[PDB]
């Protein structure tokens, strides 16, 4: 009708303006909504009718719709899948239309092919390779080779060439066209002419350009997919390609969002695993010099440390965000806006101080752990300061996980009575990693600093049992310390006062001898300490104990709060509030599982409040790994009050905590203590 053409011409302005990246996504979503709602009403008004030319527009607008519906998801969006699935149905009917025009059929087939490419990208069981191959062949048959004006033809040609269809007759115009990026040129060079120099140069240019692209961009996804394809073909370029891409990613990640932030795209774990594998493989060679091998092992440790630093979170958590006055109001909003704009950009237009790994005090041994997911392997890299040497080993972790899960499940039901499975877990730990008890790996009589990985953070590594008839414990011959990451170690000189503080808040008077000692400080709030009462210590004391409860949060680490006689002080609040605990020693009463949530997968990057205390400036924390009785905590507090010049492993050993064979409850109650922090 004469109304149909005018309506289509009016509504096409809004749909063609969608190729303008200037508009913010918050307005892009509403303008595309209007441009889609003007057209969809015609469907329910003119059911079983239309000119078959505005029918393709329903699918074309729907293709651009699944650009803003993708976010606000955790691991996979349920509406991005629906949008393409629905746009397929509204183009299948346009295909069956008998208009017979050449350009209209070409455009309809182009839209169908690109929608099917996206569907196959996000879903394989609903769109196999054979159907995509047939559809792309049909699209090529109609003459969809206008490479000089539309990048959709370039994408179609690249996808067809990656499948196994020879395309020698279009390579010249594919290369000549200026609307092709570096990755497309590299793919064309590699998959057609089997050349290597041009592919290396082009993808090197692409990787260099990638340094200024946020992680929300799809270019990272295409790059990782291409590198995976190269690895699958057993090529040689992937070893350097992975390392260069990892370097670019590490450079780009340093944006300093609240000093600890990420975006959680689907990749960035397989990329790190692939870089680790490439470095290890290129270090496995028999080079005539050992300095290059030492450099390679140091690079492996560097990669592990760079991965272990921060943690990622999802939009559901970074939206439902507790707020403060300084950082949460500005940095979080800026990061959110930057990430969203980056996500909705490439779909419109295509174009303290860190220390040194070798700076440790004499007589110290450092162990780095890494769990490889791409190959299901374990690693352990050690560095000896006196000998200036590096080593590495391997192990399997497929049954240690099951034993740990069994221990956790039994403990969650019978707290004390689950002490029999702790011995089994410790024995399994000792058997799985025998290099700990080897003189050629860790010399006996030294100090060990542990930097574990995801699910190894919850294992009592200091209570391992050697695999023999009369095996002994690890802490008997050594003295262990823990650290979530090497980036948390900072230079610190002990220049503090000599006062003691107390902060007690419990349900029953389990601590009666405590809170009545003469040595306690005058700023103690032993009768119901509150959230702002902790903020009243500013003289840098030497000891501080906080006897209270804890509240666990399952999704947001920033929402876990320390239970006090108030609304409670949270992770963000404890970072933004306490300013007077620098260089001191802290002791917590009894909690390590009241804050971290239970885990179901092999990975976990959650953090407790001990890391928060380490961040404000504390020089060390002492806590109990699981729930115990108040007698042991009170005895430890009194011992720490009496003296501070003695080690913790000596106290554990002299209390008869190494009698796991005789009384498992004694072992359970004794080996629950560990020390956090690195004495610099």
């Amino acid at each position: 009708p004469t109304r149909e053409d005018i309506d289509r011409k009016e509504a096409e302005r809004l749909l063609d303006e969608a190729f303008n990246p200037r508009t913010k996504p918050v307005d892009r979503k509403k303008i595309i909504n209007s441009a889609l709602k003007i057209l969809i009403g015609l469907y329910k008004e003119k059911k079983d009718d239309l000119t078959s030319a505005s029918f393709i527009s329903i699918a074309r607008a729907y293709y651009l719709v699944s650009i803003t519906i993708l976010p606000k998801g955790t691991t996979i969006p349920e509406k991005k899948k629906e949008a393409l699935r629905k746009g397929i149905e509204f183009i299948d009917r346009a295909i069956n239309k008998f208009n017979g025009s050449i350009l209209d059929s070409q455009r309809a087939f182009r839209i169908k092919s690109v929608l099917s490419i996206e569907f196959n990208r996000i879903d394989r069981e609903k769109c196999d390779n054979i159907k995509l191959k047939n559809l792309l062949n049909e699209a090529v048959d109609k003459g969809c080779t206008d490479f000089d004006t539309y990048e959709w033809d370039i994408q179609i040609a690249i996808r067809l060439c990656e499948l196994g269809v020879d395309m020698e007759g279009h390579f010249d115009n594919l290369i000549k066209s200026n609307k092709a990026n570096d990755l497309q040129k590299a793919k064309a060079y590699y998959f057609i002419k089997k050349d290597d120099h041009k592919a290396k140069e082009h993808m090197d240019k692409c990787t260099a350009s990638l340094k200024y692209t946020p992680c929300s961009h799809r270019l990272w996804d295409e790059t990782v997919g291409f590198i995976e394809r190269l690895k699958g073909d057993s090529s040689t370029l992937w070893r350097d390609f992975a390392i260069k891409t990892y370097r670019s990613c590490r450079v780009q990640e340093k944006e300093t969002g609240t000093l600890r932030l990420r975006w959680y795209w689907s990749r960035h774990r397989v990329l790190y695993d692939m870089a680790f594998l490439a470095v290890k493989e290129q270090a496995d060679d028999e080079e005539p010099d050992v300095n290059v091998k030492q450099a390679k092992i140091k690079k492996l440790a560097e990669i592990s440390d760079s991965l272990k630093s921060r943690f990622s979170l999802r939009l559901s958590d970074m939206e439902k965000m507790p707020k403060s006055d300084d950082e949460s109001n500005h940095e979080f909003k800026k990061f959110l806006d930057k990430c969203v704009t980056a996500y909705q950009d490439g779909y419109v237009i295509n174009r303290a101080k860190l220390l040194e790994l070798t700076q440790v005090p004499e007589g110290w041994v450092v162990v780095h752990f890494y769990l490889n997911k791409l190959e299901g392997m374990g690693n352990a890299i050690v560095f000896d300061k006196c000998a200036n040497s590096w080593q590495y080993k391997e192990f399997q972790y497929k049954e240690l996980f099951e034993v740990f899960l069994t221990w956790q499940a039994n403990y969650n039901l019978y707290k004390e009575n689950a002490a029999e499975h702790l011995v089994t877990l410790c024995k399994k730990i000792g058997e799985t990693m025998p290099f700990l008890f080897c003189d050629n790996f860790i010399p006996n009589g030294k100090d060990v600093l542990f930097v574990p990985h995801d699910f190894l953070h919850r294992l009592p590594l200091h209570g391992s049992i050697e695999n023999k008839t009369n095996g002994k414990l690890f802490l008997e011959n050594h003295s262990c310390c823990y650290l979530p990451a090497w980036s948390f170690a900072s230079e610190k000189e002990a220049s503090t006062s000599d006062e003691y503080v107390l902060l007690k808040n419990f349900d029953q008077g389990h601590f009666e001898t405590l809170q009545n000692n003469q040595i306690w400080g005058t700023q103690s709030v032993k009768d119901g300490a509150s959230s702002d009462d902790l903020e009243n210590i500013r003289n840098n004391p030497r000891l501080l104990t906080i006897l209270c409860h804890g509240e666990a949060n399952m999704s947001n680490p920033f929402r876990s709060m320390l239970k006090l006689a108030n609304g409670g002080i949270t992770y963000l609040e404890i970072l933004n509030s306490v300013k007077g605990l620098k260089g001191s020693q802290v002791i917590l009463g009894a909690c390590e599982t009241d804050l971290v949530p239970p885990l179901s997968d092999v990975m976990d990057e959650h953090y407790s409040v001990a890391t928060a205390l380490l961040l404000i400036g504390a020089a060390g924390v002492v806590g109990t790994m699981w729930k115990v009785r108040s007698n042991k905590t009170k005895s430890l507090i009194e011992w720490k009050l009496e003296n501070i010049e003695y080690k913790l492993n000596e106290w554990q050993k002299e209390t008869g905590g190494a009698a796991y064979k005789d009384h498992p409850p004694t072992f359970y109650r004794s080996i629950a203590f560990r020390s956090i922090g690195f004495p610099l």
């Binding site: 509406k79 439902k320 019978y414 239970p598």
Partner: protein, 1291 residues
């Protein structure tokens, strides 16, 4: 070797799924999800029949689980024979995986064995498990099985093995709700069967080793659940609906032909309510007829459906059918008509998600749990009843989409909102809703929890899931099977304050007072304290309210239940397990336990006496009690109240246009519906008033849309993303027993603006509740507030309450004429102390009243010159006409930038006016409720007798008459359009060209839309698409001597009027050659003495029945009323004040008998207030005289600017209203000539009959004969005499 046959019985609805092969099962998500249900297979291609069964592998799984639990409870022994740990693992190499791959924990114990189980000897556990047999993963002969489980088949023992799926199953939809926001997502659907008819299955079990018979039998007796319901295991038509759909299509076609299509929802889904009446109403035709001419009025029941009317109708069709029944007939007719009409008239986010089954290497683990030796296990049962304290609602989907077996499309949803019932039309509480509510309350009481995940490779270990894995419930049904009622709901446009487009829907709700059975079972070691806290929160006792919220629509207060008659018992599973097995755990016999004495309980079941009371549990004191806070208050209404109800008004036989709202309440005692209905105000209006007040206060109502908005309203009252944090309830009348007549009959009419007569099709009446200033109504209600509110939000709520108290927002409808005005609010004494302190703080402080300087009775100082023709004749010689016409214009000014109602503009005033009324001549206000009030319709029949208008014996004046009088005066003053007019009419002599609407000027036609523009009268008082800005109230009687007492034959407080009838438009327009003159007005005089003296033989066989008798009021009476306005300009207020009191020696007319000199009143202003709304929350104050005079002067300036003259200069000129021509002409009509000592009593009478009259006196020959011919009076002279006030007709 033996063969035992067993049967299985269900006590709750169970679930059904379609049968697929194991290889082909991976294609269907529903088949993968429902792997533990009963299976259904078709019989033939393209069929709707089949048969159902239960596989023996599932029964085997349940039996071995029961065996494991029984062995665990007894430290791995049974009857003194020890058992081993068995085996539950297989190797992928040297074999193949089993078909189901367990994903839960396994109870284990100490071995305490000396012989390894082998082919020569095995424990009963290793015998029940097919360990050492000749049958593996491939079935070959069925004989090698040492123990075999066969399939279980449905018992169709009666007849007709050809069973249809539609007669056994039904469809339903469930969903998942997010804890933080309250919204839902990822729904899914299933099938539900009927356990009352098809609930028995028979199967066979074969066992060949006599070393496990006792264990197998005990395990069979220990199984409690299967296929989603509690189970027990023992060892031995087209014509009707087709014809009705055809008739519905016929009715739809007839309605479309008659051009009445939107009216189809007034027949359909409104005659559906006849199911609450019965067949008696149609069997006697007691429907409320239509009068409309007293001959054949329709009142909804006279249509054009290609035959006889809709009254010679279903009275002849119920007899035809008589088969489905009254209820089914009405319901199916209504549903078919509604569906047809909806079909005739009429993007993303659907997200129906099913949980997937994972498959990956290293994702299967064996986790054993070893409980401590010496621990004890128990089993607690809780019984009681759930009582509904408020109407409830459990939602379902349209029955057309719920057919089990069947199913390029976008969103299109219905509006009926059905309710969940069973096959016998009884009310039901599903187990899923109860489980969801219990889980939510448990998570709230614990303080922490998790959002449920559906993948589930390892089960969650949080605080809530651990307890929820031990809780079992039951499905509940009632004993009441009567049809539910229907609630209507609309929305208002904030701009024009009227009904918005696309804003109508209805819901079905149940009665309040019903009771349902309640069962809860917990198994474990120790009874938790959080569960006790939840139970105590749900219970009600000794001034405490139950706090159980179930179902949807919690924001409008639907579905608050209460728990009573609680009994708690306890089993002991370490020494009383044989008794538990023998009694089957009382599965299916819970009502007997609810109604059983203590001595009759079986062995093993003992009462539990350790249930903690309130105030002793740490939970429920820091978490549950401060969750919701209650505010209660009483509202006093001193005016008639009407919340309109249309379907009831057109259904009950009272034959009334509009009636009040009422509901049905169920009575627990004697199990019946209480036949006295209760009047109330719906909670939707209660919520809407508060929401609108808050939005207008904070200015968030003006936003265009709230798609992702997060304004203050979206925070307090919620939006489409997050639920609401405030919940309202009903306001119920409590003093209805103090009125001898609770409802009053009031009539209304519309008056034509040209002829002064009642318009056609403009008569209507209302039936509101009776309220008076000295005897007001009482309403009591409440609402709940969630914790976490800031001080600003509490201040806003308190300000809204104060605004409601002051009287800004009336309740109900017709609030612009004095209905539903609030007098005061009395807050209860149990509300929080801070709320009362804030109410006291925000209460209106002492206003800035003028210190009695110029704050007295504001009296205008103005003198009109008056007409001079009667001034020079003090001998009373001339004769004048009763009425004259006023002509002005025609030049009407219209405005396009009309003022919206959603903001208190800073430069606009808003206050109230108080005024008094004094009468000069006798006043008559008839009361048409009773046509025989004086009780004299005996010996004299056909003579109507009224009295004075009153409520509860208090003389009053309705606000409608005052509003109409001042509206007409303002229209005359401001030369606005004709609001009321008779568009179509014809004139005949003793055959005109056009109708009476054709001669009217184009500009004077009434406004019909908001685009062209609104004249000042319509822009100020209101239109059909624009709510007015002024309000009027009722006037009460204060003082006065008495009635007009006479001395005759009738009662002394009465009088007999004359003949008044039939105004004649065809008198001012001779024949097709003149236009209408304009508005018509009467004159003030003292002609009421002629009626009084001619009484007593005015009745003596002269007027048989054409006269009426009514009470009268004497001179010197005083009435007082109020006027409200808001968002007014300056000159508008000046004009309003000027029109309310033009000045001295000028009065108004009001009442019946105007052309006889009756009903002349004078109005004076007593005071004036104005409240200012700013950021600092200013208060009310009294304005002095200077600003009032400034307002009047500004109004004069605006009027003279509107005049358009430029010769007259503008400035600070004293107000002389006689300069403007039309204003002076209008003021000449209202001049009182007998006020001061200038009596000058004139003589105004209608012309008498020609020669055979009664009061005709000789002389001037004033009859119509002389002045009716074009020889003594030309037409132009007659028009000039009509259009000139105080023109004598004496010559």
């Amino acid at each position: 070797d033996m063969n035992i046959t067993v049967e299985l019985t269900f006590f709750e609805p169970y679930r059904l799924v379609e049968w697929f092969d194991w290889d082909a099962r991976k294609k269907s998500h529903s088949a993968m999800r429902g792997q533990a249900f009963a299976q259904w297979t078709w019989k033939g291609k393209g069929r709707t029949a089949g048969k159902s069964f239960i596989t023996g592998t599932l029964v085997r799984s349940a039996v071995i689980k029961a065996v494991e639990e029984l062995l665990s409870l007894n430290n791995g022994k049974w009857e003194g024979v020890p058992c081993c740990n068995g085996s539950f693992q297989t190797d992928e190499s040297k074999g193949k995986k089993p078909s189901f791959l367990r994903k839960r924990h396994t109870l284990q114990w100490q071995a305490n064995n000396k012989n390894i189980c082998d082919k020569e000897e095995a424990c009963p556990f290793c015998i029940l498990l097919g360990r050492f047999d000749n049958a593996g993963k491939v079935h070959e002969r069925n004989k090698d099985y040492d123990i075999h489980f066969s399939n279980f088949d449905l018992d169709h023992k009666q007849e007709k093995n050809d069973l249809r799926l539609v007669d056994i199953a039904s469809g339903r939809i469930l969903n998942r709700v997010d804890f933080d926001t309250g919204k839902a997502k990822d729904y899914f659907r299933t099938w539900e069967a009927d356990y009352e008819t098809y609930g028995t299955y028979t199967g066979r079990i074969t066992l060949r080793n006599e070393h496990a018979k006792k264990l197998l039998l005990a395990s069979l007796g220990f199984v409690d659940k299967l296929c989603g319901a509690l189970c027990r295991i023992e060892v031995i038509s087209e014509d009707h609906n087709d014809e009705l759909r055809k008739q519905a299509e016929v009715i739809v076609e007839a309605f479309k032909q008659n051009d009445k299509l939107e009216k189809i929802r007034i027949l359909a889904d409104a005659i559906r309510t006849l199911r609450l009446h019965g067949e008696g109403v149609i069997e006697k035709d007691e429907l409320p007829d239509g009068k409309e001419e007293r001959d054949k009025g329709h009142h909804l029941w006279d249509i054009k459906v290609q035959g006889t009317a809709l009254r010679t109708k279903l009275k002849e069709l119920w007899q035809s059918n008589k088969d489905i029944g009254w209820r089914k007939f009405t319901e199916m007719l209504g549903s078919n008509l509604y569906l047809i009409y909806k079909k005739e008239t009429g993007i993303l986010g659907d997200t129906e998600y099913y949980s997937k089954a994972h498959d990956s290497e290293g994702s299967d683990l064996f986790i054993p749990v070893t409980p401590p030796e010496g621990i004890e296990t128990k089993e607690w049962i809780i019984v009681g009843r759930l009582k509904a304290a408020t109407p409830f609602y459990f939602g379902v989907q349209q029955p057309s989409d719920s057919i089990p077996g069947k199913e390029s499309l976008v969103i299109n949803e219905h509006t009926s909102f059905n309710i969940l019932l069973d096959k016998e039309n009884r009310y039901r509480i599903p187990r899923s809703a109860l489980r969801g509510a219990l889980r939510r309350d448990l998570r709230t009481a614990f303080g922490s929890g998790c959002n449920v995940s559906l993948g589930g490779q390892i089960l969650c270990n949080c605080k809530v899931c651990i307890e929820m894995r031990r809780i079992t419930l039951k499905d509940s049904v009632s004993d009441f099977s009567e049809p539910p009622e229907i609630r209507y709901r609309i929305a208002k446009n904030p701009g024009t304050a009227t009904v918005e487009d696309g804003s109508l829907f209805d819901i079905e709700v149940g009665p309040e007072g019903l009771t349902f059975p309640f069962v809860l079972r917990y198994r474990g070691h120790k009874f938790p304290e959080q569960l006790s806290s939840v139970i105590r929160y749900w219970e009600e006792n000794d001034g405490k309210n139950g706090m159980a919220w179930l179902g949807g629509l919690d924001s409008t207060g639907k579905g608050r239940f209460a728990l009573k008659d609680i009994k708690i018992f306890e089993w002991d599973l370490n020494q009383k397990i044989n008794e538990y097995i023998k009694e089957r755990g009382m599965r299916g016999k819970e009502k007997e336990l609810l109604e059983m004495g203590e001595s009759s309980l079986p062995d093993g079941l003992i009462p539990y006496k350790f249930f903690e009371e309130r105030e002793c549990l740490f939970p429920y004191k820091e978490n549950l009690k401060p969750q919701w806070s209650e505010v209660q208050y009483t509202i006093e209404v001193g005016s008639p109240l009407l919340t309109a109800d249309t379907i009831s008004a057109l259904t009950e036989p009272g034959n009334r246009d509009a009636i009040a709202y009422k509901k049905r309440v169920y009575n627990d005692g004697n199990n019946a519906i209480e036949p006295e209905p209760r009047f109330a105000v719906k909670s939707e209006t209660h919520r809407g008033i508060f929401r609108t007040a808050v939005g207008r206060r904070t200015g968030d109502l003006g936003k265009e849309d709230h798609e992702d908005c997060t304004c203050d309203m979206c925070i307090i009252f919620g939006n489409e993303h997050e639920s609401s944090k405030i919940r309202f309830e009903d306001l119920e009348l409590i003093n209805g027993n103090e009125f001898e007549k609770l409802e009053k009959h009031i009539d209304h009419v519309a008056i034509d603006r040209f002829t002064g007569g009642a318009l056609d099709k403009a008569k209507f009446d209302t039936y509101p509740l009776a309220g008076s200033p000295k005897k007001p109504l009482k309403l009591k209600g409440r609402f709940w507030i969630k914790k976490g509110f800031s001080g600003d939000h509490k201040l806003l709520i308190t300000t809204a309450l104060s605004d409601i108290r002051d009287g800004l927002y009336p309740l109900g409808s017709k609030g612009g004429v004095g209905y539903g005005w609030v007098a005061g609010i009395s807050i209860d004494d149990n509300v929080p102390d801070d709320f009362k302190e804030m109410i006291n703080k925000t209460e209106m402080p002492l206003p800035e009243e003028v210190e009695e300087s110029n704050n007295g009775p504001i009296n205008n100082d103005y003198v009109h010159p008056g007409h001079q023709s009667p001034k020079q004749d003090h001998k009373n010689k001339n004769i004048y006409y009763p009425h004259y016409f006023l002509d002005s214009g025609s030049k009407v000014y219209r405005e396009k930038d009309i003022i919206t109602h959603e903001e208190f503009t800073e430069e606009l005033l808003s206050g109230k006016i108080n005024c008094k009324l004094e009468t000069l001549t006798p006043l008559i206000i008839p009361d048409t409720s009773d046509e025989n009030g004086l009780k004299l319709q005996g010996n004299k029949p056909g003579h109507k007798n009224y009295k004075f208008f009153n409520i509860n014996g208090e003389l009053m004046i309705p606000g409608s008459e005052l509003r109409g009088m001042l509206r007409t005066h303002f229209e005359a003053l401001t030369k606005s359009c004709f609001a009321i007019f008779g568009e179509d009419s014809t004139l005949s002599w003793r055959c005109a060209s056009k109708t009476l609407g054709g001669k009217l000027d184009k500009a004077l036609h009434p406004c019909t839309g908001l685009s062209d523009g609104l004249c000042p009268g319509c822009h100020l008082f209101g239109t059909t698409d624009y709510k007015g800005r002024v309000k009027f109230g009722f006037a009460k009687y204060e003082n006065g001597p008495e009635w007009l007492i006479t001395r005759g034959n009738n009662p002394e407080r009465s009088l007999t009027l004359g003949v008044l009838e039939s105004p004649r438009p065809a008198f001012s327009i001779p024949d097709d050659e003149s236009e209408i003159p304009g508005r018509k007005f009467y004159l003030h005089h003292n002609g009421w003495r002629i009626i009084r003296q001619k009484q007593l033989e005015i009745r003596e066989t002269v007027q048989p029945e054409r006269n009426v008798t009514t009470e009268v009021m004497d001179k010197g009476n005083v009435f007082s009323f109020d006027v409200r306005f808001e968002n007014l300009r300056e000159w508008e207020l000046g004009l309003l004040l000027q029109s309310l009191d033009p000045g001295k020696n000028i009065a108004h007319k009001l009442g019946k008998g105007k052309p006889y000199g009756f009903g002349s009143v004078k109005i004076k202003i007593d005071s004036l207030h104005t409240f200012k709304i700013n950021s600092n929350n200013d208060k009310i104050k009294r304005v002095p005289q200077s600003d009032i005079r400034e307002y009047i002067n500004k109004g004069y300036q605006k009027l003279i600017e509107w005049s358009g003259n430029n010769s007259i200069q503008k400035g600070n000129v004293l107000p002389q209203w006689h300069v403007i021509p039309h204003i002076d002409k209008l003021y000449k009509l209202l001049w009182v000539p007998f006020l001061n000592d200038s009596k000058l009593e004139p003589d105004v009478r209608y012309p008498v009959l020609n020669e055979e009259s009664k009061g005709y006196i000789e002389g001037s020959d004033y009859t119509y004969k002389k002045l009716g011919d074009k020889d003594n009076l030309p037409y132009k002279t007659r028009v000039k005499g009509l259009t000139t006030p105080w023109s004598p007709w004496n010559p």
